[PDB]
């Protein structure tokens, strides 16, 4: 097949109305461009991450994540002088930067 | 669930924490290192097959 560019012309094709070579080329045209342009009627209809995203699950997760983070704010009756600060380094990041600074003189 | 989306620290954190650029161009510095290993492997598949 792989019919033509002349078979795609408007003269050899039907229009809103109101030969043999044309009716032979339009067989191969409609037999080529209906196995090429047909959509996939099976799975892999996900196509990406941002099509199977769920508004209901994210809305439920945000309803939980706002409620518990607001219960963290108001109901935690620890005064501001008593809120102890967290460490800016870990127990492993403080070992690796003692190791690499020891090995930095090479 | 390999999400390609969440490998990016796009703007809002990197403007606040400037070390994230030092993180991100770290990762890119890894990504051209492993590729240098990859062109190495296709090198070592070649020369043995050459010999």
């Amino acid at each position: 097949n792989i019919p033509s560019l002349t078979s795609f012309a408007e003269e050899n094709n039907y229009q809103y109305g109101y030969t043999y070579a044309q009716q032979q080329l339009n067989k191969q045209r409609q037999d080529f461009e209906r196995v090429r342009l047909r959509p996939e009627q099976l799975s892999n209809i996900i196509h990406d991450e941002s099509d199977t995203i769920s508004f209901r699950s994210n809305l439920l997760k945000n309803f939980i994540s706002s409620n518990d983070a607001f219960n963290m704010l108001s109901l935690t009756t620890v005064p501001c002088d008593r809120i102890e600060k967290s460490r800016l380094f870990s127990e492993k990041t403080i070992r690796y930067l003692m190791q690499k600074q020891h090995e930095m003189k090479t | 669930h390999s999400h390609p989306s969440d490998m990016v620290i796009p703007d809002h954190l990197a403007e606040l924490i400037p070390e994230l650029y030092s993180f991100q161009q770290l990762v890119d510095s890894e990504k051209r290192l492993d590729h240098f290993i990859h062109l190495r492997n296709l090198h070592m598949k070649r020369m043995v097959a050459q010999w």
Binding site: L88, F89, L97, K100, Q101, M104 | E19, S22, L26
Partner: peptide, 24 residues
């Protein structure tokens, strides 16, 4: 500068050490 978080002189030198080791 972020001296509100990095208030101690220790943690500022630790952050500078981190940037130094990254660049090296």
């Amino acid at each position: 500068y972020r001296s509100h978080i990095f208030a101690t002189n220790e943690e500022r030198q630790m952050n500078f050490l981190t940037n130094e080791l990254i660049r090296l």
